[PDB]
């Protein structure tokens, strides 16, 4: 199977700082099918960066996915008090059909 | 439906062992091949023209590379769709799933033998798009042929 | 498997090694060796830091009138050399036709896409595709953009004749097909 | 665009009830549906998926394979999940998503519903 | 009807504010866009291919005009229907109503949103023709929709 | 308004100024000044009775090998000069590349369509259409016929650069697209 | 269906006495002519464009050969289907029945005036093929038009 | 006769001798004589087997700068010369432009499709088809194959001007339509 | 080709009757119809016009707008003119003509009917 | 509105002489939609020229329309006894839909 | 592919019986089928030939033209030959063949039936 | 009418030797429509060559049709004991529709 490993597990950064997440897959992954979702408590997961580099609708400039064909990073231009939540990396294809990471928490 | 060949399956073309990578024999019905006569938007039909030309040239003309190359630059280029060639080059430069002309996929009816026009199996990152990556694209193709055969079946 | 019950999914993959006699072929071996072949005659394109030709000459006055002269291969070399943007600098291209075809493209910088390297790599991009020597859009951020031209770290580009001995998995005649569209499309007034 | 949740409740192991996400406001038959859940204290996990149009291909996670059943009805724009023989491990909040798999569009889940609660004890 | 775009209206293309001259949003359904992705007889479709290419080129490649021009000459000309380009030049030289590819007209269904393939608005003597100059042509196009939509309505 | 009750008539007009960065543009202002632009780099095409260059010199041996040399604009000039019917006489074409692109066509007779003026106006006709410099069929009777070549009363046609500052209304790349077909279509054996 | 001509048979095109070899007047209905104004897979349609362009050029432009030849190479050459032109050259080099663009055969309805798209009368060994040499091919066209006319007749 | 009872078989044959004013024409009277014409101006292509021009000179510097110079015909000659595969040797092509257009191709060997004769006959093959001067596949057995190039037993090929006098049955413009796509297609680097 | 006139007569002001030009010998539903009249001692003037096929667009001269009605029925191949609330100025001879408005050919009226006389006093 | 002015009002020329008419419009007029008609007594109007330069069917070589925009003409190569009638010019488009001239009369 | 023969026998001059070659295993309506006989001591000779997709065109040899009749029925996939007024010269063995006449294929008879014996005296 | 003349009438060659037949037509004949058939007693006629040079299915390499547009031939690479039968030449078109030769016999 394919496992998506998210490092570091948690981030403790002050508002206005710049953050960089990371998603790692066991196999070699087609970057066309890598998406990032922001999950914030009551709110349903919110798509941010589909295609590993393209922002979704109504996504600020801050969210900007990146990464080569093996490493899948997500960075924040200047993290704000409104974007403290759980960040997931997702892959489509392989086994299982939809692969989700263990999650990464960003806290003050 | 009139048929077109530069050489010698009833009503359609058929593919020999030495022109298919991993199959002894695979070929298609009359309806699908007839489309490649009129249509020029499918990368599969460019294979049919190149396969057909190569079969005819090998049987009728003795081997020679200087004169076969010069006839290719002058004459045979018109058998390749010019818009398709440059489109897939643009899809390559932007790193989106493009067609490198090798593998094609199609649907075959279980009994009647009706066969869709094969569509290219796209590649990216040096890897073919995996069978489930265009699953919803296959579903509409199956529904496209349901109407196409039902229209002919009802009118009899 | 089976779609809608009464249709099934299957695939056909063409083997293009049997087209070798009638139409040409274009390939890249690893990342730096590339081969264009017609029948059994072929060409070797190598991206190296090693210089083979040192003399400052690319002369064809005597090359055409020699005891041996491959017309099939000289057709390909002429087609490729005429797909380079603008005018090729003879201060940067050396040739040697004593025994076989051997042309050296210097490609030393002496701004990323406006140099002689960027023009030569445009000829490479059309014939051999964009599989190698390119960086995709989404590698340096979601707003980072890639250059127009393919870029290389190597210095020299060598084209030499080489008998075809199955160095590749045949790709078809589309590499040379795209070259003929771009031949002398941007050739300068001179 | 909107997916509307439905179903949910509390039930002991042995019997189960189906979920429903009757999406409306868009072309239902043109998109493939998904089911996603999140166990309390655990991250997001995939549950099921059914393709567009006829829905011939239905994919399940190996953990819940054999007792879950994902189905859809494009006639009236409703998505189901028939659960059988629920277990205390299945207690979680369940989501319904929307996705389309083709060449033009990269893979993503775009329009989600709201949580559906399922307690098993 | 499969639809492809080099860049990223469900099932069809949509036009942005900065590419439409005097409107905020005008764009078309799935049925009409598919015809431009299969045929090359309509002059409107050559515009969509140019708009689509320009949008993708700007987002993925940094600005550079020396290299954008060269890729235009070698590659992008294939996205323009050559026969249509030479025809309108012939209609221009003979002083008959021709098209410089700027203004197009179409019919939009009041309820269903169905939209015809836009047809060029023709210019002669340095002036656009009024709608009354080709009124009978519009009446003919409206009947094409009626048969085309009723064909799908009966079969359901 | 409304056709057949359930359809309505509406029009779409494309603003072609946003296609400025990727694909070229060719348009005319007022029958005397014509503009070809790529991105922000443009060209001045003026029909004048005023002569700018007096010397009989057009050498590109040294112009190409200079630090100041626009590759984008020199591509257009080379394309336009190669679409001229027959062979252009260097007795009638003068050049100046000291302070940018500047070339001169005499177009002076010193029979109407068989002259150097008619050949040059054929290049102008393809790139810029037939909006100007043409007479329609029926101006001189119901059986009066018009020459193929576009005719002008001016003598000199000058080409110089300009920096694009909205001299004109954008027309699209179709003008330069038609030039590509006609480039060297009627060259002579030489 | 809209029909265009460079020049000015209601709804279609008609052929003149000094324009056909051995006939005072032959021409075709609206249905068949429209296909040539939208498609390019038939060789008969390349004749119509050359015929139509020549008629307009003679009436509007005074005679001149060096200017008419240049416009043919640069502009008018694009009116000839390149794939069809360079396929029949391949069929001529292989000594198989090809078309030299002279004689075309078609079926015309006895009463309604309905007319098929004319197909070329192929030649080989310097001799035309007898009508019996492709009799079954003619039988395809007859049954094609039964369905085509029954399609429009039933729908009303 | 009548098919299905309500359709009748009929044929149309185009008299394309009226396309002579606008589009050119390429004919072949018999094996030795072939004709290319535009309007009333024409060319004489004779596979004569005896020489007409003996001097070893082909210069076009003087020919262009003469009062007598046909632009229509010299366009045709320049189109045919650049359709010859490879590069034409001036050791084998003699020219004379004192009165009209006359150029001589030597076509003597001094192994059959690789000669100068095979290249010239490739230009002949495209313009005039394979109606004459070719041997079909099934003449020397059911497994006997034919050469790629058309073969001639003659020695010289002369091109001369000739006012049109209905020397053939008009063939249409397709003769030179294929020539335009052959022009400089296989040109060498030079 | 031929347009056959009909109608005609004299009526006092207020009373009115319709005109008719039942053309035959060609395809009626493709061509657009017009109405032209000529007052005594006066030149030709345009009256009405109805487009082809469904006749969605009907155009009138401002002089006779509001009381002149133009209509056609392609089924019977006939063109009418329901002209009401007559006036002494309306006394003239009326014509029916034929025209097609497309890009293919210029605009003209080529096939005309014969005179129809109308007297109002 | 658009008004078509035909000058001169009347013509009196001997048989076998050229007769040049005129048709002036207050607007800028597309030459493609200008037609001339001959109206003679009981005969219905007969189309002579359409598109300002194209002779209709069964029109002798004598009739010849001409003229650019805003300045239209009509000339008779050699007027015969049967071509004495009222000559009209029209335009299609603008206001009204069809605009007719006042009429030019040709007599002996 | 297989053509199955039928009919046959002997009959005195004056009356005759039809022949049948009910081919099966392929598409009947696409192929044109012929009749070939061979008199004892004589070579092969052509008898009749009917085209396909309706059998509009039927050609007979002038030796037997007028009394023979070739017909086909694409519904039941069978080819007939209605002989009338047989003559002692017609004693021979008769064959049925299959052919297709188009641009793609050359002319040749491909699949034959077996011998059918006809005796008349 | 067209007549197909086959010469010589009878062949008597030893096994393992080349046998060359000939078919002659009165008129000029398109080589595309010329076929050869082998007829062996009880067996139905068996197609050997069509198009005058194309071997059919199941036809050994020995059989080889040839001939120009006037004189037709048929050769046997090395005749075997089982290829002794009657060889016919055929032509489609002209009068009658199907033309057959008189037949050439090959014997020991
Ligand atoms: C040449 O074409 C380019 C691109 O087609 C034009 O530049 C683009 O102009 C648009 C609209 O003026 C710019 O969009 C603007 O973006 C900013 C934020 O980025 C926002 O404040 C504005 O409301 C508007 O949306 C766009 O950024 C700009 N550049 C690109 C790369 O698209 C340019 O105007 C054209 N020049 C001429 C002389 O026609
Ligand atoms: C380049 O790709 C080619 C595959 O054809 C390989 O080059 C060969 O490498 C082997 C082992 O090093 C040598 O024995 C051969 O001589 C090489 N070929 C030639 C033509 O020199 C290899 O995979 C790649 N070579 C690199 C990366 O240096
Ligand atoms: C490729 O180009 C480089 C740089 O243009 C050449 O190296 C230079 O040669 C010149 C010749 O005068 C010297 O002045 C420079 O010092 C050299 N080095 C550099 C870094 O510029 C090089 O010679 C060329 N290649 C070959 C094979 O000659
Ligand atoms: C050929 O030479 C070039 C430079 O002369 C090498 O490119 C360097 O690659 C390294 C990778 O370790 C980079 O860190 C350097 O920055 C590159 N150089 C420059 C100037 O950018 C290239 O790797 C050499 N290749 C071989 C096979 O020797
Ligand atoms: C490139 O071609 C040249 C010449 O065709 C080859 O060099 C010849 O190789 C043969 C081997 O059979 C020698 O006998 C000759 O002496 C060589 N020279 C000439 C002038 O013929 C060369 O081998 C080819 N390159 C490769 C890589 O095979
Ligand atoms: C045409 O091109 C030339 C060459 O670029 C321009 O001349 C230069 O203009 C700049 C202005 O920034 C001056 O600083 C330079 O001294 C000029 N000369 C050179 C050799 O660079 C010229 O300006 C261009 N024409 C116009 C109208 O801008
Ligand atoms: C441009 O103009 C003419 C075109 O031939 C030439 O100069 C003329 O030469 C003739 C004959 O020698 C004289 O009658 C004229 O007076 C000359 N000048 C002009 C302005 O016509 C020459 O090719 C060019 N001359 C210049 C000054 O640029
Ligand atoms: C440029 O010069 C030419 C001729 O040298 C001028 O063309 C003349 O235009 C007038 C307009 O009234 C005509 O009457 C003349 O017949 C034309 N000359 C010839 C020789 O035919 C042209 O107008 C001049 N333009 C400018 C701006 O000075
Ligand atoms: C080929 O063209 C040349 C030049 O046009 C013709 O030779 C001229 O013929 C005319 C007859 O009108 C003579 O008066 C001239 O003296 C000839 N020479 C020149 C230089 O003009 C020649 O006749 C043409 N060839 C044929 C076969 O018609
Ligand atoms: C055409 O070419 C032939 C062969 O190249 C020429 O005849 C040869 O001339 C050379 C010149 O030295 C002699 O060495 C040969 O002996 C000649 N004969 C042969 C058979 O090669 C001939 O002269 C050329 N024709 C013309 C008109 O110049
Ligand atoms: C297409 O790309 C795949 C992926 O590497 C490769 O295996 C295949 O050979 C390629 N096809 C061709 C025709 O080059
Ligand atoms: C097309 O021509 C008309 C003529 O006036 C003009 O108004 C319009 O702007 C032209 N379009 C373009 C894109 O130049």
Range of the domain at J62: 4-106
Residues G104 and H13: their CA atoms lie apart, in Å, by: 6
From edge to edge, which strands make up the β-sheet containing C25-28? C25-28, C33-38, C41-48, C156-161, C102-105, C93-96
Residue L65 host element (H or E): strand L63-67
**CA G68 / ligand 7 centre spacing (Å):** 30
CA distance B85 to chain E (A): 9
CATH code, domain with J9: 2.60.40.10
Tell me the CA distances in angstroms from F97 to B153, C114, F81, F101, J72, one per residue in order: 73, 20, 15, 5, 49
Best probe of the D interface among B91, B119, B135, B137, by most D CBs < 10 A, is B135
Among I118, I111, I96, I70, residue whose Cα is nearest residue I5: I96
Q: Which residues contact F78 (CB under 8 A, 6 or more apart)?
A: C186, C187, C188, C189
B: neighbours with 3+ CB pairs under 8 Å? A, C, D, E, G, H, K
Contact between D95 and D6 under an 8 Å Cβ cutoff? The reply is no
CA distance A18 to chain C (A): 14
Helix (H, G, I), strand (E, B) or coil at D79: strand
Helix axes B82-93, B43-60, angle to 10 degrees: 120
E: neighbours with 3+ CB pairs under 8 Å? B, C, D, F, G, I, J
Q: Percent helix, strand, coil in chain G (nearest 5)?
A: 50, 15, 35
Yes or no, beta carbons of C4 and B146 under 8 Å apart: yes
What is the maximum span of chain I, computed from C-alpha positions, in angstroms? Answer: 45
Task: Tell me which method was used to determine the 3D structure.
Answer: cryo-EM
- Cβ < 6 Å from ligand 11: which residues? B 100-102, 123, 126; C 16, 169, 171-172
- Which chain K positions have a beta carbon within 8 Å of B2's beta carbon? 102-103
Contact between H73 and H41 under an 8 Å Cβ cutoff? The reply is yes
Yes or no, beta carbons of A30 and B125 under 8 Å apart: yes
Contact between A99 and A23 under an 8 Å Cβ cutoff? The reply is no
Atom 16 of ligand 8: nearest residue by CA position: F153
CA angle C3, C4, C5 (to 5 degrees): 90
- Which chain A positions have a beta carbon within 8 Å of C142's beta carbon? 49, 53-55, 63-66
Residue with tokens 């185009």: H14
Q: What six digits make up the tokens of L71?
A: 């004189």
Pairing of strands K9-10, K116-119: parallel
Pairing of strands D92-99, I92-99: unpaired
Among K68, K38, K37, K63, residue whose Cα is nearest residue K50: K68
Q: Does J70 touch chain F (CB under 8 A)?
A: no
Q: From the alpha carbon of E99, which atom of ligand 12 is closest?
A: 1
Residues C132 and C141: their CA atoms lie apart, in Å, by: 21
K: neighbours with 3+ CB pairs under 8 Å? B, G, H, L
Q: Which residues contact H100 (CB under 8 A, 6 or more apart)?
A: H70, H160, H161
**CA B49 / ligand 11 centre spacing (Å):** 20
Q: What six digits make up the tokens of C45?
A: 């394109």
Q: What six digits make up the tokens of H168?
A: 């053939």
CA angle B87, B88, B91 (to 5 degrees): 95
Size of interface C-D (CB pairs under 8 A): 8
Among D113, D111, D115, D109, residue whose Cα is nearest residue D93: D115
* Ligand with smallest separation from the Cα of F32: 8
Q: Where are the domains of chain G?
A: 14-155
- Which chain J positions have a beta carbon within 8 Å of E129's beta carbon? 30, 93
Pairing of strands J63-68, J10-12: unpaired
Q: Which residues contact F29 (CB under 8 A, 6 or more apart)?
A: F35, F167, F168
User: If contacts are CB pairs under 8 Å, which of residues 131-150 in chain F contact chain J?
Assistant: 136-144
Helix axes H116-128, B65-74, angle to 10 degrees: 30
Pairing of strands L10-12, L104-107: parallel
DSSP string across chain E = -----S---TTS-B--GGGBSS-S--B--HHHHHHHTT----HHHHHHHHHHHHHHHHHHB---HHHHHHHHHHTGGGGS-HHHHHHHHHHHHTTS-B--S-EEEEEEETTT--BPPPEEPPEETTEEPPTTTTHHHHHHHHHHHHHHHHHHHHH-
Q: What six digits make up the tokens of C188?
A: 């300068």
Residue F27 host element (H or E): strand F25-28
Query: Resolution limit in angstroms?
Result: 3.2
Atom 12 of ligand 4: nearest residue by CA position: C153
Contact between H106 and H93 under an 8 Å Cβ cutoff? The reply is yes
Residue C76 host element (H or E): helix C71-81
Residues K22 and J83: their CA atoms lie apart, in Å, by: 77
Residues L23 and L103: their CA atoms lie apart, in Å, by: 10
CA distance C96 to chain E (A): 30
Residues K97 and K75: their CA atoms lie apart, in Å, by: 18
Residues I24 and B127: their CA atoms lie apart, in Å, by: 68
Of E134, E139, E142, the CB nearest to I103: E134
Q: What six digits make up the tokens of E5?
A: 């775009």
Helix (H, G, I), strand (E, B) or coil at J32: helix
Yes or no, beta carbons of E136 and I57 under 8 Å apart: no
Q: What six digits make up the tokens of E97?
A: 């109503």
- Domains of chain K (ranges; CATH) run 2-120 (2.60.40.10)
Best probe of the H interface among B8, B69, B70, by most H CBs < 10 A, is B70
Residues F119 and L60: their CA atoms lie apart, in Å, by: 65
Q: Does F16 touch chain G (CB under 8 A)?
A: no
Q: Which of C106, C107, C117, C157 to mutate to test the pocket of ligand 3 (most atoms within 8 A of CB)?
A: C106
Q: Does B156 touch chain K (CB under 8 A)?
A: no
Q: Does G63 touch chain I (CB under 8 A)?
A: no
Yes or no, beta carbons of J30 and E127 under 8 Å apart: yes
Contact between H38 and H44 under an 8 Å Cβ cutoff? The reply is no
End-to-end alpha carbon distance in chain G: 17
Best probe of the H interface among C74, C90, C93, by most H CBs < 10 A, is C74
Return the CA Rg of chain K.
14
Of J42, J56, J98, the CB nearest to I46: J98
Of E38, E60, E75, the CB nearest to B89: E75
- Cβ < 6 Å from ligand 4: which residues? C 49, 153-155
Contact between D43 and A101 under an 8 Å Cβ cutoff? The reply is yes
Q: From the alpha carbon of H155, which atom of ligand 10 is closest?
A: 1
- Which chain F positions have a beta carbon within 8 Å of E92's beta carbon? 129-131
**CA H163 / ligand 9 centre spacing (Å):** 10
């Amino acid at each position: 199977d394919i496992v998506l490993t998210q490092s570091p597990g948690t981030l403790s950064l002050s508002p206005g700082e710049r953050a960089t997440l990371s998603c790692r897959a066991s196999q070699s992954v087609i970057s066309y099918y890598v998406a990032w979702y922001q999950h914030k408590g009551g709110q349903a997961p919110r798509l941010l960066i589909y295609g590993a580099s393209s922002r979704a609708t109504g996504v600020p400039d801050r969210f900007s996915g990146s990464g080569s064909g093996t490493d899948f990073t997500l960075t924040i231009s200047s993290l704000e008090p409104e974007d403290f939540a759980l960040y997931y990396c997702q892959y489509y294809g392989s086994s299982p059909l939809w692969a989700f990471g263990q999650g990464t928490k960003v806290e003050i | 439906t009139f048929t077109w060949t530069l050489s010698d399956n009833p009503g359609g073309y058929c593919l020999t062992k030495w022109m298919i990578l991993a199959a002894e024999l695979k070929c298609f019905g009359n309806t699908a091949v007839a489309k490649c006569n009129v249509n020029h938007d499918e990368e599969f039909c460019d294979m049919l023209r190149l396969i057909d030309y190569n079969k005819a040239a090998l049987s009728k003309f003795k081997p020679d590379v200087e004169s076969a190359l010069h006839l290719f630059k002058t004459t045979v280029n018109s058998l390749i769709s010019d818009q398709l060639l440059m489109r897939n080059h643009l899809r390559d430069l932007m790193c989106v799933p493009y067609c490198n002309y090798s593998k094609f996929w199609y649907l075959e009816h279980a009994k009647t033998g009706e066969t869709s026009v094969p569509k290219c199996w796209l590649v990216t990152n040096g890897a073919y798009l995996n069978e489930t990556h265009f699953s919803d694209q296959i579903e509409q193709e199956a529904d496209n042929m349901i109407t196409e055969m039902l229209r002919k079946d009802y009118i009899k | 498997d089976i779609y809608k019950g009464v249709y099934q999914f299957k695939s056909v993959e063409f083997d293009m090694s049997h087209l070798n006699l009638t139409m040409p072929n274009a390939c890249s071996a690893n990342n730096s060796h590339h081969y264009i072949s017609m029948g059994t005659s072929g060409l070797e394109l190598t991206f190296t830091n090693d210089s083979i030709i040192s003399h400052n000459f690319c002369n064809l006055t005597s090359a055409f009138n020699k005891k041996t002269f491959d017309h099939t291969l000289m057709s390909i070399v002429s087609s490729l050399h005429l797909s380079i943007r603008g005018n090729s600098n003879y201060k940067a291209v050396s040739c040697d036709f004593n025994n076989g075809i051997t042309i050296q493209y210097n490609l030393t910088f002496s701004s990323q896409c406006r140099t002689f390297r960027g023009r030569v790599l445009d000829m490479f991009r059309t014939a051999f595709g964009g599989k190698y020597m390119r960086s995709c859009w989404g590698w340096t951020g979601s707003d980072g953009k890639t250059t127009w031209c393919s870029q290389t770290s190597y210095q020299y580009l060598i084209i030499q004749n080489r008998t075809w001995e199955n160095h590749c998995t045949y790709a078809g005649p589309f590499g040379m097909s795209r070259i003929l569209l771009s031949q002398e499309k941007t050739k300068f007034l001179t | 665009v909107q997916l509307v949740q439905s179903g949910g409740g509390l039930v002991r192991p042995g019997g189960s009830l189906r979920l429903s996400c009757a999406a409306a406001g868009f072309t239902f038959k043109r998109y493939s549906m998904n089911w996603v859940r999140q166990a309390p204290g655990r991250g997001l996990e995939w549950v099921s998926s059914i393709t567009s149009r006829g829905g011939s291909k239905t994919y399940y996670a190996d953990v819940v394979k054999g007792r879950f059943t994902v189905s859809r009805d494009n006639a009236k724009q409703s998505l189901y999940l028939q659960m059988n023989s629920l277990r205390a491990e299945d207690t979680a909040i369940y989501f319904c998503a929307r996705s389309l798999h083709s060449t033009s569009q990269p893979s993503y889940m775009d329009v989600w519903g709201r949580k559906i609660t399922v307690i098993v004890s």
